[PDB]
Structures are given as C-alpha cells and as structure tokens.
Amino acid sequence: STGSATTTPIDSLDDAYITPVQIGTPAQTLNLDFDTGSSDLWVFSSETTASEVDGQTIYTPSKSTTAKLLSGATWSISYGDGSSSSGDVYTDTVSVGGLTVTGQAVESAKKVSSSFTEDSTIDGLLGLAFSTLNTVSPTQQKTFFDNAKASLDSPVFTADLGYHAPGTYNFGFIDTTAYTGSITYTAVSTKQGFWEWTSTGYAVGSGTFKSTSIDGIADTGTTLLYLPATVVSAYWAQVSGAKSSSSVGGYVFPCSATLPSFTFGVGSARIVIPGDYIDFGPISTGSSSCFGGIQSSAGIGINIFGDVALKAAFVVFNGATTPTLGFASK
Ligand SMILES: O[C@H]1[C@H](NCC2CC2)[C@H]2CO[C@H](O2)[C@@H]1Sc1ccccc1
C-alpha cells in the first residue's frame, strides 16, 4: 500500500504545515501538523475544555462507529515552546492520503495550552518520530507510520515541504519525479527517539564550506533552523544590521536586507537554503525589524533541522530495520 497527501502552509510565513487526515467512521477530517519530532497523534475533540477551543475542527468519538475508548489510557505532552496538551485515548481508523490504519491510537485532548487554542488552523498533531517517545500511559502506543509500516510497499515516508506553497507527504514510495539529482542517505541514531543525524558542515552565501560535524534532528514540526551559536553568528554577521535581541528572543535583521543563502552538508552532498527562506517577517505588525529563520540552539540542548532546512530538500525518512535519512535537492 501507499498514501499521498498534500501539506499546506498555515500562513504566509510558513509558520507550520497542515495535512488533512480522516479519522473515524464516517470520516471526520481534521487538519493535523505532521511532526517528525514527536510521536503522539492527538486531536482537538468534543472532550476539549470548551474555553480552550477557538475555531479548530474537533473529533467527536461518540459519532464514530469504529471508535473504542482505550480503557485507563491517558497522555500528556509538552513541546519546545512550552506549549502542552493532555487527555484520554481512543483507537479508531485513521487514513492519510488513501493509506488506512485500523486501531490507531487517537489521543483526544481534554486540555490544551493557550498557543494551541490561539492557532485556529491546527486541529492536532500527527507524530512521526519513533514510538519510544509516545506519551500514552500505562501502555505506550505506536505512531501512524509504525502501524502502517509492514503494509507499505517500502517502509518509508517522504517530506516535500513547499516554500510559500503546498507540498506533499508520501507513505510507502519515493516519487522519483519530485527531486533533482540523487538522494544522499546518511546514518540515523534513534537513541533519543528522533530522526537524529550528523550534518557534515555548512556555508554562508557564496562563502567557503566549513567541514564540521553538526548533530541534529530532522523535525518537520519545528518552524526554524536551530544550530550552534558559532554557526548562527557566522550567518548573521553577513547581514548588515542584524543582531541578537534578548527582548525579541533571537536574531533580528532589517527588513530591507537581502539575506544570503545557507548551505548544509549531507555527506558529500550540499543542500542550499535560499536567503528568502530565512525571512520570517516583521517582529510585530508594521515593524521594520524582521525575525530570522536561523537561530541558536544553545538553550535547547539539541540542533534542529526544522522546516527552514527541510523545505529546501526532498527528505526520505527510511524506516528500514536500520533507519536512515535521505536528502535531495529539488
Ligand atoms: O517551531 C516551534 C513550534 N511552533 C508551532 C508552529 C505553529 C507555529 C512548536 C513545536 O515545537 C516548538 O514549538 C518549536 S520551537 C522549539 C524549541 C525548542 C525545542 C524544540 C522546538
């Protein structure tokens, strides 16, 4: 089997991407944030505290003839930005782009934090990291990919995120028309539950490539590119007037600037992030100070190849017995 679904930016800055997902019988379609940095599939629901729902589409398990409460099961998660959600668990039928999993754990939110409430465009998350990170207690549950894997033509999924444009998530096959040149595969460590790999270095604009190992995670659920302070300083030093602002919470730059590209290494291959991918627009409406799309990971504990990096590539999440990651230009 295979599946193929279009993923769409939630706003003009590509702050996140949403992908339609069918849950239950009859289908209830929710727009979920596919997140390769977490392992819970959770949704706004009929159980979510009413004051914490503000325009999201909800899953109503009582209207699904295939929904079954998973007795005694609860979940609770918190993300890097300090947002969180929690609730109870159903199993139900879940389909993505024509690929169907029966008995998928669908984690129904009873509570969500303010950031989730305030984002009307995201109805929940679909985790695609390793199932060892799944938060369901007392019995940990499998991700959609882990449940689908054995049925797939090939045990893989691919992320092809667009810049200011729709893109695609494919399950079970590699669309050889969706990239240029070859896909370069690189080793993954699953020891922290992430698609964790080591980039071979970087360049800023037309500058010389610096060979240096950068361990980080391929994370579709993180908007920006978070890298070591040394690397980030080298990037922003090439932008006149750019500075790290403690008040704003990172590097900002004059909106009149032309940003240089940023290249990262995948083995001997190179992925080039165009400068405009690194522009996240005015810090507040009407400001001429713009927020940068490359930021320091110093306060995080891990480097994160988020959407700013991934959208510059066709990315293969290879879930073979020994997982690997593939990157191609496009
Ligand atoms: O990019 C943000 C995400 N924003 C959601 C998007 C709709 C706007 C969420 C999910 O994860 C964090 O908060 C990351 S920042 C991060 C920081 C430290 C560690 C990991 C990630």
Check: CB of residue 42 under 8 Å from CB of residue 33.
no
Interstrand relation of 41-43 and 250-254 (parallel, antiparallel or unpaired): unpaired
**Cα separations (Å) of 184 from 72, 98, 329?**
44, 28, 10
Q: Which technique was used to obtain these atomic coordinates?
A: X-ray
What spacing in Å lies between the alpha carbon of 134 and ligand 1's midpoint?
A: 18
| Token couple for 198 | 């080591």
CA dist., res. 231 & res. 264, Å (int): 11
Give the Cβ contact number of residue 95 at 10 Å.
20
Atom of ligand 1 lying closest to residue 224 CA: 1
Q: Which fold has domain 175-330?
A: Cathepsin D, subunit A; domain 1 (2.40.70)
Burial label for 218, CB within 10 Å (0-12, 13-18, 19+), is buried
- 5-174 and 175-330 in the same fold: yes
For residues 54, 56, 60, 65, the Cα torsion angle rounded to the nearest 10 degrees is 170
Q: Whose CA is nearest to atom 3 of ligand 1?
A: 222
- The alpha carbon of 255 is separated from its chain's Cα centroid by a whole number of angstroms, namely 26
5-174 under CATH 2.40.70.10, yes or no: yes
| Token couple for 136 | 């369901």
What spacing in Å lies between the alpha carbon of 80 and ligand 1's midpoint?
A: 5
| Token couple for 274 | 């165009």
Mutate which of 31, 223, 225, 226 for ligand 1 pocket (most atoms within 8 A of beta carbon): 223
Q: Which residues are catalytic?
A: 35, 199
CA dist., res. 122 & res. 18, Å (int): 7
CA dist., res. 272 & res. 259, Å (int): 13
Q: Can you give the residue ranges of every domain in the chain?
A: 5-174, 175-330
